[PDB]
């Protein structure tokens, strides 16, 4: 059924300019107003704007905040809206995401997409470093990520198979570098006599590493 | 018009009522409706909606949560708490400029747990590449107060540290805690016992973990 799927997003430079979309399906597209909302990290959500139906002509609405920076558009024929960001700062730095606004007799922010973060700086793309943690009943093994830019990355472990007994520690920035790691607790009765590797993805960079964790 | 959320930040045990407050500066109801949303938002994922029109529960959600109020005034009330709860909680001007309010906190109290302590050496690629980084995981505890001191050869080092917590864990309501020590290669050969002192109220004295570099 509904479905809003958001691309676009990733690193660009202080006065820059970037362009998120947001891909629906599963709806009368043209009869609903589309939304952007964005939540810089850690912070509150902020509303930013609507794009209206074709009863009301595609007509736009901006937050105080984005008037005259921001623009709100639509491609009905492929059921996309988008999001044109000029002039970006600091401050614009967050997760964005889309949602369908009002259409039928509907509620508005029922449906929204999984989002996609924006960075903005000077900073320049950096792979990550990928590490295995290895140990000296149960037992935790690791993955450190290190000196990468910007965010995201994503961890799994086994391609997915692995799941519960699995920590992924938030990024820190340390001087233009972000650094992360994350955790699995698996039974001892199991490593290393089945495999355990973490499968780390940079799509900022088109990484992607698989590390096993093998014993010292 | 701005929203105003409560305490910010609450904490409520397992079972229990949950009451998060939300005013509006200025009515945000008609004669017929209320235009109140409340969202749930958990780390890493869209908010999700939970309450429409101030008082009706939307489709899929489970009956704990309930919303109610007017004028001004609105309530999120969750009855009883439970584990997955774990979340951020946003209500939102339903109509006109949409405005969000700022998010509660929500804690899942439980009893203490003592945390699980893992220390791991620079990754011998690392080494090969010339960094160094020893790595200390403190899993599954709570209270989330907690603090880590590394020493090198027996002295507390306080610079490069990298500290990181989880959010709350939705299956158990422990909190994660990842504690970096980052060293150039040169400091890492130059010293030999490694250690992170894990400080936490379920016991009287840290709960130690330790290496020696030339043992390994
Ligand atoms: N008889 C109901 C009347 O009581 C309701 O309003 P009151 O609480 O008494 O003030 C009214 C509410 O209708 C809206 C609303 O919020 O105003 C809008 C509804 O959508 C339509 C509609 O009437 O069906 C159709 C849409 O395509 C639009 O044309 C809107 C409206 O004309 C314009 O809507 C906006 C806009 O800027 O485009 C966005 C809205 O969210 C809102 O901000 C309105 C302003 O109120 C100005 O009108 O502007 O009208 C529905 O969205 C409706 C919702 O389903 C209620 O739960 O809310 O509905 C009467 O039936």
């Known amino acids: 059924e509904v479905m809003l799927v958001e691309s676009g997003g990733g690193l660009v430079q202080p006065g820059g300019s970037l362009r998120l979309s947001c891909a629906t399906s599963?709806?009368?597209?043209?009869?609903?107003?589309m939304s952007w909302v964005r939540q810089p990290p850690g912070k509150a959500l902020e509303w930013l704007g609507f794009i209206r139906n074709k009863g009301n002509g595609y007509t736009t609405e901006y937050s105080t905040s984005v008037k005259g920076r921001f623009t709100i558009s639509r491609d009905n024929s492929q059921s996309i809206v988008y999001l044109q960001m000029n002039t970006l700062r600091a401050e614009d730095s967050a997760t964005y995401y889309c949602?369908?606004?009002?259409?039928?007799?509907?509620?508005?922010?029922?449906?929204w997409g999984q989002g996609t973060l924006v960075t903005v700086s000077a900073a320049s793309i950096t792979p990550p470093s990928v590490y295995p943690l290895a140990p000296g009943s149960m037992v935790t093994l690791g993955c450190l990520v290190k000196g990468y830019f910007p965010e995201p990355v994503t961890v799994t472990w086994n391609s997915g198979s692995l799941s519960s007994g699995v920590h992924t520690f938030p990024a820190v920035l340390q001087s233009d570098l972000y650094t992360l790691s994350s955790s699995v607790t698996v039974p001892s009765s199991t490593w290393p006599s089945e495999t355990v590797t973490c499968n780390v993805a940079h799509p900022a960079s088109s990484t992607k590493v698989d590390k096993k964790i093998v014993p010292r | 018009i701005v929203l105003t959320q409560s305490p910010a930040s609450l904490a409520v045990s397992l079972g229990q009522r949950a009451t998060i407050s939300c005013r509006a500066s200025k009515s945000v109801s008609s004669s017929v409706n209320s235009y109140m949303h409340w969202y749930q938002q958990k780390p890493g994922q869209p908010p999700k909606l939970l309450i429409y029109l101030a008082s009706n529960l939307e489709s899929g959600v489970p009956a704990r949560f309930s919303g109610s109020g007017s004028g001004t005034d609105f309530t999120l009330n969750i009855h009883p708490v439970e584990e997955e709860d774990a979340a951020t909680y946003y209500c939102?001007?339903?109509?006109?400029?949409?405005?969000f309010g700022g998010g509660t906190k929500l804690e899942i109290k439980r009893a203490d747990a003592a945390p699980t302590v893992s220390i791991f050496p620079p990754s011998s690629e690392q080494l090969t590449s010339g960094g160094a980084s020893v790595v200390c995981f403190l899993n599954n505890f709570y209270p989330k107060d907690i603090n880590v001191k590394w020493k090198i050869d027996g002295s507390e080092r306080q610079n490069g540290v990298l500290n990181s917590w989880t959010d709350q864990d939705s299956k158990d309501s422990t909190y994660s805690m990842s504690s970096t020590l980052t060293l150039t290669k040169d400091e890492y050969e130059r010293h030999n016992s490694y250690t992170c002192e894990a400080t936490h109220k379920t016991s009287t004295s840290p709960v130690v973990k330790s290496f020696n570099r030339n043992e390994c």
């Open positions: 939102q001007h339903s109509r006109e400029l949409r405005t």
């Open positions: 949602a369908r606004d009002i259409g039928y007799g509907n509620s508005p922010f029922a449906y």
């Open positions: 599963g709806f009368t597209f043209i009869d609903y107003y």
